[PDB]
Enzyme design. Structure first.
Site, PDB file in Angstrom:
ATOM      1  N   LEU A  29     102.139 -16.867  81.428  1.00 19.40           N
ATOM      2  CA  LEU A  29     100.577 -15.886  81.857  1.00 19.40           C
ATOM      3  C   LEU A  29     100.688 -15.803  82.992  1.00 19.40           C
ATOM      4  O   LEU A  29     100.165 -17.103  83.468  1.00 19.40           O
ATOM      5  CB  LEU A  29      99.738 -15.917  80.250  1.00 19.40           C
ATOM      6  N   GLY A  30     100.216 -14.591  83.543  1.00 12.20           N
ATOM      7  CA  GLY A  30     100.383 -14.657  85.589  1.00 12.20           C
ATOM      8  C   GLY A  30     101.151 -15.323  85.728  1.00 12.20           C
ATOM      9  O   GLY A  30     102.790 -15.308  85.083  1.00 12.20           O
ATOM     10  N   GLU A  31     101.292 -15.721  87.718  1.00 17.95           N
ATOM     11  CA  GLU A  31     102.491 -15.915  87.742  1.00 17.95           C
ATOM     12  C   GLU A  31     102.575 -17.365  87.882  1.00 17.95           C
ATOM     13  O   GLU A  31     103.439 -17.400  87.326  1.00 17.95           O
ATOM     14  CB  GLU A  31     101.946 -16.098  89.559  1.00 17.95           C
ATOM     15  N   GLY A  32     101.169 -18.544  87.898  1.00 18.84           N
ATOM     16  CA  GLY A  32     100.060 -17.670  88.413  1.00 18.84           C
ATOM     17  C   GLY A  32      99.633 -18.936  89.287  1.00 18.84           C
ATOM     18  O   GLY A  32     100.386 -20.231  89.231  1.00 18.84           O
TER      19      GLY A  32
ATOM     20  N   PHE B 262      96.598 -20.175  88.472  1.00 20.46           N
ATOM     21  CA  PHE B 262      96.041 -20.629  87.693  1.00 20.46           C
ATOM     22  C   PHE B 262      97.072 -22.089  86.937  1.00 20.46           C
ATOM     23  O   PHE B 262      96.424 -22.824  85.916  1.00 20.46           O
ATOM     24  CB  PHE B 262      94.799 -20.689  86.575  1.00 20.46           C
ATOM     25  N   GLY B 263      97.775 -22.082  87.791  1.00 13.66           N
ATOM     26  CA  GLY B 263      99.155 -23.191  87.548  1.00 13.66           C
ATOM     27  C   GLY B 263      99.612 -22.509  86.452  1.00 13.66           C
ATOM     28  O   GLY B 263     100.031 -21.655  85.828  1.00 13.66           O
TER      29      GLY B 263
ATOM     30  N   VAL C 117     100.346 -21.191  82.548  1.00 17.42           N
ATOM     31  CA  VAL C 117      99.455 -20.385  81.618  1.00 17.42           C
ATOM     32  C   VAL C 117     100.279 -20.085  81.128  1.00 17.42           C
ATOM     33  O   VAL C 117     101.075 -18.876  81.225  1.00 17.42           O
ATOM     34  CB  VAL C 117      97.933 -19.773  82.556  1.00 17.42           C
TER      35      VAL C 117
ATOM     36  N   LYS D 284      95.734 -23.119  79.327  1.00 20.11           N
ATOM     37  CA  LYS D 284      95.832 -23.729  80.715  1.00 20.11           C
ATOM     38  C   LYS D 284      95.733 -25.895  80.091  1.00 20.11           C
ATOM     39  O   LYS D 284      95.428 -26.318  79.570  1.00 20.11           O
ATOM     40  CB  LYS D 284      94.726 -23.725  81.590  1.00 20.11           C
TER      41      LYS D 284
ATOM     42  N   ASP E  91      83.257 -19.062  93.934  1.00 12.23           N
ATOM     43  CA  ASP E  91      84.234 -18.016  93.963  1.00 12.23           C
ATOM     44  C   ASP E  91      84.164 -17.125  93.252  1.00 12.23           C
ATOM     45  O   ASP E  91      85.715 -16.901  92.300  1.00 12.23           O
ATOM     46  CB  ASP E  91      85.807 -19.060  93.456  1.00 12.23           C
TER      47      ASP E  91
ATOM     48  N   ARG F 110      89.748 -11.452  91.938  1.00 12.83           N
ATOM     49  CA  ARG F 110      91.277 -11.832  91.181  1.00 12.83           C
ATOM     50  C   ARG F 110      91.076 -13.283  90.094  1.00 12.83           C
ATOM     51  O   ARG F 110      91.336 -13.556  89.468  1.00 12.83           O
ATOM     52  CB  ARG F 110      92.115 -12.584  93.157  1.00 12.83           C
ATOM     53  N   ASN F 111      89.555 -13.851  90.215  1.00 11.80           N
ATOM     54  CA  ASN F 111      88.912 -14.442  89.397  1.00 11.80           C
ATOM     55  C   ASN F 111      88.155 -14.280  88.091  1.00 11.80           C
ATOM     56  O   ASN F 111      87.080 -14.458  87.370  1.00 11.80           O
ATOM     57  CB  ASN F 111      87.770 -15.031  89.766  1.00 11.80           C
TER      58      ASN F 111
HETATM   59  N1  LIG Z   1      97.275 -11.044  80.821  1.00 11.14           N
HETATM   60  C1  LIG Z   1      96.838 -12.278  81.239  1.00 11.14           C
HETATM   61  O1  LIG Z   1      97.424 -12.179  82.822  1.00 11.14           O
HETATM   62  N2  LIG Z   1      95.912 -13.054  80.977  1.00 11.14           N
HETATM   63  C2  LIG Z   1      95.601 -14.383  81.723  1.00 11.14           C
HETATM   64  S1  LIG Z   1      96.379 -14.254  83.067  1.00 11.14           S
HETATM   65  N3  LIG Z   1      94.860 -16.533  83.224  1.00 11.14           N
HETATM   66  C3  LIG Z   1      94.748 -15.805  81.877  1.00 11.14           C
HETATM   67  S2  LIG Z   1      93.456 -17.756  81.699  1.00 11.14           S
HETATM   68  C4  LIG Z   1      93.011 -18.059  83.259  1.00 11.14           C
HETATM   69  C5  LIG Z   1      92.975 -19.611  83.764  1.00 11.14           C
HETATM   70  C6  LIG Z   1      91.838 -20.453  82.464  1.00 11.14           C
HETATM   71  C7  LIG Z   1      90.893 -20.261  83.190  1.00 11.14           C
HETATM   72  C8  LIG Z   1      90.283 -18.514  82.462  1.00 11.14           C
HETATM   73  C9  LIG Z   1      90.596 -17.503  83.540  1.00 11.14           C
HETATM   74  C10 LIG Z   1      89.244 -16.572  84.242  1.00 11.14           C
HETATM   75  C11 LIG Z   1      89.481 -15.881  85.190  1.00 11.14           C
HETATM   76  C12 LIG Z   1      91.099 -15.734  85.258  1.00 11.14           C
HETATM   77  C13 LIG Z   1      91.722 -16.288  85.207  1.00 11.14           C
HETATM   78  C14 LIG Z   1      92.168 -17.480  84.604  1.00 11.14           C
HETATM   79  C15 LIG Z   1      94.527 -15.032  81.519  1.00 11.14           C
HETATM   80  C16 LIG Z   1      93.396 -15.216  79.927  1.00 11.14           C
HETATM   81  N4  LIG Z   1      92.797 -15.076  79.697  1.00 11.14           N
HETATM   82  O2  LIG Z   1      94.035 -13.987  78.900  1.00 11.14           O
END
Ligand SMILES: NC(=O)/N=c1\s[nH]c(S[C@@H]2CCCCc3ccccc32)c1C(N)=O
Length: 289
Positions: free
Chosen positions: A21-24, A26-27, A29, A45, A145, A149-150
């Site tokens: 999920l994502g690129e990402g 956040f590492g 995911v 995560k 932050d 994007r968050n």
């Molecule tokens: N559709 C799709 O891309 N969903 C994605 S991408 N990254 C995630 S979790 C990510 C990192 C963990 C902390 C929570 C959090 C909080 C804000 C942004 C990213 C994240 C999801 C999801 N929760 O559905």
């Protein structure tokens, strides 16, 4: 809830990782199936050191306590093996920055075309972020932050705040003093110059988020280099009024962008104004990708 104080531990056999999920950013995911939690889809995560595991539980204890309608739901952890697992709710439409850009005028032209994000839909996104920030201020928690994007988008244009700057750096971050990666374009003068992060610095960041929403996810100060960005912020220069932004909303942005933190508009006041504007201009049109 009082019960939220305590971290929920999930069994490894109840987690089935499905895909990335994502690129990402956040590492790693993953999209996963979670059983006996009440099966459901979740976001996983992953995190392998005595001090790093200590910080993991510290982070889990912080995340478990932050529960609100507009805060990405933290379900719990799995510390049975390597890597350590953090379980969050699944937000179908992903990060808000990507969502804003996918519904921009350029995305409509360069496209089955997506629908252009309306002013009513922009206000609906804005009030939800402001609601989540009111909650964080009530818990004396400083995000540090806040940016699109968050934030994550779910069904029925549901928007939630997440991350809080925990762990994780793209072009949206600058190595302040050659020591800390910080989101300068979203930061007030005191946070860049003195590294002072407060509810007031989060208010400034909320103003920048409002600018991001009204510009369909454009990078703030896009015309500028990182050094020029800091010069503009510290001097007292402001972001331009977006083409689709009503004067009332731009004046709210200016209220967030006061040079001195004590001069900025209160979070409760910002939310009340956005809530009233969103109620007066409700969302009813079909939204296509
Ligand atoms: N559709 C799709 O891309 N969903 C994605 S991408 N990254 C995630 S979790 C990510 C990192 C963990 C902390 C929570 C959090 C909080 C804000 C942004 C990213 C994240 C999801 C999801 N929760 O559905």
């Amino acid at each position: 809830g009082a019960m939220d104080t305590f971290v929920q531990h999930i069994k490894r056999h109840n987690i089935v990782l499905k895909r990335e999920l994502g690129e990402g950013a956040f590492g790693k995911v993953f999209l996963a199936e979670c059983y006996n939690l009440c099966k459901i889809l979740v976001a996983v995560k992953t995190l392998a050191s005595d001090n790093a595991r200590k910080d993991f539980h510290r982070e889990a204890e912080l995340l478990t306590n932050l529960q609100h309608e507009h805060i990405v739901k933290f379900y719990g952890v799995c510390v049975e093996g390597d890597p350590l697992i953090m379980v969050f709710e699944y937000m179908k439409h992903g990060d808000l920055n990507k969502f804003l850009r996918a519904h921009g005028p350029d995305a409509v032209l360069m496209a089955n075309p997506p629908t252009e994000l309306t002013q009513s839909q922009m206000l609906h996104i804005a009030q939800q972020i402001a609601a989540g920030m009111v909650y964080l201020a009530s818990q004396h928690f400083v995000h540090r932050d806040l940016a699109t994007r968050n934030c994550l988008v779910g069904e029925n244009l549901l928007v939630k705040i997440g991350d809080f700057g925990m762990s994780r750096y793209s072009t949206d971050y600058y190595r302040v003093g050659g020591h800390t990666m910080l989101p300068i374009r979203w930061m007030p003068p005191e946070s860049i110059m003195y590294r002072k992060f407060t509810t007031e610095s989060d208010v400034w960041s909320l103003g920048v988020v409002l600018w991001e929403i009204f510009t369909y996810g454009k990078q703030p100060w896009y015309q500028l280099s990182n050094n020029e960005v800091i010069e503009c912020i510290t001097q007292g220069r402001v972001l331009q009024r977006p083409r689709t932004c009503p004067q009332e909303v731009y004046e709210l942005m200016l209220g967030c962008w006061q040079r001195e933190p004590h001069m900025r508009k209160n979070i409760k006041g910002i939310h009340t104004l956005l809530q009233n504007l969103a109620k007066a201009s409700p969302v009813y049109l079909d939204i296509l990708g």
